[PDB]
Structure 1
Amino acid sequence: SFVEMVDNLRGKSGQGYYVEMTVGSPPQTLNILVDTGSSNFAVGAAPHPFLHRYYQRQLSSTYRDLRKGVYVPYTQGKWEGELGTDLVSIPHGPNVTVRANIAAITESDKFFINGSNWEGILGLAYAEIARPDDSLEPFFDSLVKQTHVPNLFSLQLCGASVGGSMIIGGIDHSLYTGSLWYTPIRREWYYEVIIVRVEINGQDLKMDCKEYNYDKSIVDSGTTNLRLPKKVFEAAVKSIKAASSTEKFPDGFWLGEQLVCWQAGTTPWNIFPVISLYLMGEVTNQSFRITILPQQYLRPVEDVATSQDDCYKFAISQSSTGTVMGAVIMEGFYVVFDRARKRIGFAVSACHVRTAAVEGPFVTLDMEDCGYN
């Protein structure tokens, strides 16, 4: 019954999507951010200025202390805590219960966001990148092994308050339109894929495709923006600045720091070009592309003066650790993390809240060489 999982996600724009879960006995309810960019399941287990509530191990009879510490650093933010196991369930998900590893966060820095509504994080990636090491089985692996839930999940993240769906164990045909296109997972650690071509405003970036995946390209629901390697980021911004030459924006805008407003309903979408990302396909020399609209990479933010002007932020930033296809990229699509077949599927999302596209086939030679080594 995937229908019961539809809309099981929510959150605030730019602060991630979270799902409700329960841990321990009796069940303790908490909101957990869905992160395909990590592999650790962790929850606040101690007081914190931004935590509405937290996991109380003492109150759980099924709690088991592993007597081992843990530290996890992200692109932004970090925490440390005590490892242990307990019973976990997902109210608006599969009707099952499993014992999984849980990191009880005792201390953190720039991790919890003031007013996010979530008190934990669910790393959905592979054990390979779990801390302290790959012997700490990730939550999804425990779920699949302890239950009959198929080895895959799908995410439908809807743009701007924000909502979405995490279908655990399968694909929900009502969450997308058109056909699903699959790209191979290059290696099972992060959900790594290979970008074989990039176009902006219909113009090819004419860069060595390896630059697009330096030093890797991952799909991360836990990162809001689209992050690009330095050299690719510079070329993208240049192309995007030109296409919107009709207008001028502060340098802070192009840094994702500042924000630009406009009269409610007067946002000049026509001046902002679409971005096409071509991904390695499933048959020889075959690829496909997903198109990202400005309505995606221009994240809407709170009005400065008063509710009357639509303000936005450039949701594209620079990266020194490879390409990151974040939420703004995932918003336009229904994304299938097909672990069982080591592939990720993309299809036009059913959530309207204009539209992005997924088209193929296209031809590209030596696709594997686009991957960085």
Structure 2
Amino acid sequence: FVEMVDNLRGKSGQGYYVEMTVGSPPQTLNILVDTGSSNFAVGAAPHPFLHRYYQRQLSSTYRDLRKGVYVPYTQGKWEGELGTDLVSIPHGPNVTVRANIAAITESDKFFINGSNWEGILGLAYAEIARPDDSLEPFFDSLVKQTHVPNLFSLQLCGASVGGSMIIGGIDHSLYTGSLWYTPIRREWYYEVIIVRVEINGQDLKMDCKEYNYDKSIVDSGTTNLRLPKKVFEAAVKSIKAASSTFPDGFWLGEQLVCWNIFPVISLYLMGEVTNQSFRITILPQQYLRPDCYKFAISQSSTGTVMGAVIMEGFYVVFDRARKRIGFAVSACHVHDEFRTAAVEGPFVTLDMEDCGYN
């Protein structure tokens, strides 16, 4: 899948985007790759910050679904007008598909002043599609209308950033060692189960249910590694102890600071087999973001969010066909001379089911 290697671009902190075309003739747009949502939505009006937008009036293949959508989220929101049209991906598979498209008509704190993307591609499942599961997501529509295998993978590499979205398969050149797989728990977000956490090899020893309170997901849409309040509290306390060789606001992402004094962080994830897990390990070069750095770990109320902090350490395979997600050491991650990002197993971990939440 070399046709698709390096098909992702971005600016530090503004997400990864992939080139797409909408309509006939085809209108090129940059679209942010978001495994944390399920809507395909593009700017359709001349917002001041946009470089380009979907002009439905120029598209012969556009169809109106005569319905609107309102997507509040943490801060702020987008609204748009539902329709369908022919979507293609220049550096993806050689296909065209009729997909649902929210034409974004009003917006608040959604588009970024400075960025180079004007739409979002939600890669998660129908269950969290807006306004409801009846709105078939792009990838569901892709697989239905073609022989493209039900699978995609991302290697996020990280002003300018880059990466690869391999649609329909796996590019082995993008990783080293073996892939290890965690089960997708429920097909809405990409939910998984964290079974253990270690800072510099030292278990946090928390009820593992607290690691998935009330959710843990894989989110290319997030920059941070985001932990639930309790966990993060313990997480940071332990990171602080490890790093005894900084002001409290910093740890809270209220201020900035300006490698080896820092502890590697390990997540054990539920394995494919009963009482079996594996672990992914990241370096400070990953949770310390650019000499001023931001502490890229942060408390959360929505659960654990495995964002670019995690994802930029690994080649991540979203194997929808088998309801599972694989992690491999990324052949691009930034590592120094001593520590390296790692994916290791198997381990024996009892009672992994209990780490889940209901």
Contact 2:151 2:169 (C-alpha < 8 Å) held by counterparts: yes
Aligned-partner Cα distance in 2 for 1:41–1:250: 41
Contact 1:278 1:288 (C-alpha < 8 Å) held by counterparts: yes
Contact 1:159 1:328 (C-alpha < 8 Å) held by counterparts: no
Q: Please, which moves more after superposition, 166-175 or 74-83?
A: 74-83
Aligned-partner Cα distance in 2 for 1:176–1:217: 24
Aligned-partner Cα distance in 2 for 1:372–1:212: 9
Q: Which residue number in structure 1 is paired with residue 22 of structure 2? A: 23
Q: 1:370 to 1:135 in 2, by over 3 A?
A: same
Q: Spell out, residue by residue over 1:39-66, the C-alpha distance to the aligned partner (whole angstroms, 9 max, x if none).
A: 0000011122321111111111111111
Contact 1:182 1:281 (C-alpha < 8 Å) held by counterparts: yes
Aligned-partner Cα distance in 1 for 2:83–2:128: 18
* Partner SS, residue 53 of structure 2: coil
Q: Which residue number in structure 1 is paired with residue 172 of structure 2? A: 173
Deviation at 1:291, TM superposition (A): 0.3
Q: 1:323 to 1:148 in 2, by over 3 A?
A: same
Deviation at 1:272, TM superposition (A): 1.1
Unaligned 5+ residue runs, structure 1?
262-268, 301-309
Counterparts of residues 45-194 of structure 1 (less than 5 Å): 45-159=44-158, 161-194=160-193
Q: Please, which moves more after superposition, 162-171 or 110-119?
A: 110-119
Deviation at 1:160, TM superposition (A): 7.3
Contact 2:312 2:333 (C-alpha < 8 Å) held by counterparts: no
Aligned-partner Cα distance in 1 for 2:314–2:240: 25
* Partner SS, residue 212 of structure 1: helix
Deviation at 1:297, TM superposition (A): 0.6
Aligned-partner Cα distance in 1 for 2:76–2:280: 30
Q: Spell out, residue by residue over 1:201-228, the C-alpha distance to the aligned partner (whole angstroms, 9 max, x if none).
A: 2211010000000001000000110111
Aligned-partner Cα distance in 2 for 1:144–1:88: 13
Deviation at 1:352, TM superposition (A): 4.2
Q: 1:80 to 1:213 in 2, by over 3 A?
A: same
Aligned-partner Cα distance in 2 for 1:298–1:161: 17
Q: 1:183 to 1:352 in 2, by over 3 A?
A: closer
- Determine whether 1:257 maps to 2:254: yes
Contact 2:87 2:99 (C-alpha < 8 Å) held by counterparts: yes
Q: 1:156 to 1:76 in 2, by over 3 A?
A: farther
* Partner SS, residue 173 of structure 2: coil
Aligned-partner Cα distance in 1 for 2:16–2:252: 23
Contact 1:171 1:336 (C-alpha < 8 Å) held by counterparts: yes
Aligned-partner Cα distance in 2 for 1:49–1:271: 44
Deviation at 1:101, TM superposition (A): 0.2
Deviation at 1:259, TM superposition (A): 1.8
Q: Which residue number in structure 1 is paired with residue 221 of structure 2? A: 222
Unaligned 5+ residue runs, structure 2?
none
Contact 1:332 1:355 (C-alpha < 8 Å) held by counterparts: no
Aligned-partner Cα distance in 2 for 1:335–1:234: 27
Aligned-partner Cα distance in 2 for 1:60–1:257: 46
Q: Which residue number in structure 2 is paired with residue 266 of structure 1? A: none
Runs of 4+ with >4 A deviation: none
Deviation at 1:75, TM superposition (A): 3.8
Aligned-partner Cα distance in 2 for 1:107–1:242: 47
Contact 2:42 2:119 (C-alpha < 8 Å) held by counterparts: yes
Deviation at 1:257, TM superposition (A): 3.4
Root-mean-square deviation (Å): 1.1
Name the count of aligned residue pairs: 354
TM (normalized to structure 1)?
A: 0.93
Q: Spell out, residue by residue over 1:217-262, the C-alpha distance to the aligned partner (whole angstroms, 9 max, x if none).
A: 000000110111100011111111222222xx2333212232222x
Aligned-partner Cα distance in 2 for 1:160–1:358: 28
Q: 1:232 to 1:160 in 2, by over 3 A?
A: farther
